[PDB]
Ligand binder design. Structure first.
Ligand SMILES: CCC(=O)N(c1ccccc1)C1CCN(CCc2ccccc2)CC1
Ligand SMILES: CCC(=O)N(c1ccccc1)C1CCN(CCc2ccccc2)CC1
Lengths: 113, 113
């Protein structure tokens, strides 16, 4: 029962920058990953950037180097800094929560020489 | 109550390839994301690749083009095809399940000119 509210959208000029926010409320203590997605006109919704509780980030090829995902843990807010915008960035941007669960026992990989 | 068992690790020479598998059992119907992590000696466990129930994948920069994550939904098994191994890939590799939640209403971004 986690609630997500995205803000910061609007009209932006090409090459400019925007900052999107996603405010999470409800039972957020279990949420240890957050993701930003976008649905560009005519296309499928796609992951753009994600961040987990350790602070690790990962980005899609289409935004890598341009977008930055960050978080304010004290207020349960995730931010998507979008730079160097083009018309190809026009989309509805969506925030999503994740509860990452248990791990396996693992398997050793050793690479020689 | 989800159990994960990784297999397929071993000794490989540089430039070789490995195929890891992760068998999930238990109450898996809610699990709609799976990730592979690695923990090299002395460092934090780190995301290598993840896949969700719609087939979307994301990879860390260090493995993109070398590793492929895939899934057999019929058997609740995920695979990590590891190609072009280097000595820096030596680690314990872990599988991990995740439940990604609902979406917000989203926020529209329109980029002009
Ligand atoms: C990568 C995400 C992550 O791990 N989080 C997160 C989630 C959404 C948006 C921004 C960040 C945490 C979720 C839990 N909040 C704690 C809230 C709290 C405070 C006091 C008592 C009980 C609960 C810390 C941040
Ligand atoms: C991307 C992850 C994902 O969506 N899952 C998944 C989880 C782990 C590993 C591979 C996939 C689904 C979990 C539920 N199973 C469904 C039903 C079932 C039950 C028992 C045996 C076989 C099938 C479909 C796949």
């Amino acid at each position: 029962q986690v609630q997500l509210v995205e803000s910061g959208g609007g009209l932006a000029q090409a090459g400019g920058s925007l900052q999107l926010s996603c405010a999470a409320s409800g039972s957020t203590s279990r949420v240890n990953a957050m993701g930003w997605y976008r649905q560009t006109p005519g296309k499928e919704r796609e992951l753009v950037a994600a961040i987990d509780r350790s602070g690790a980030t990962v980005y899609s090829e289409s935004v890598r180097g341009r977008f930055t995902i960050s978080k304010n843990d004290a207020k349960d807010i995730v931010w998507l800094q979008m730079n160097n915008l083009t018309t190809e960035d026009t989309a509805v941007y969506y925030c999503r929560s994740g509860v990452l669960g248990s791990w396996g026992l693992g398997t050793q990989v050793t690479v020689s020489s």
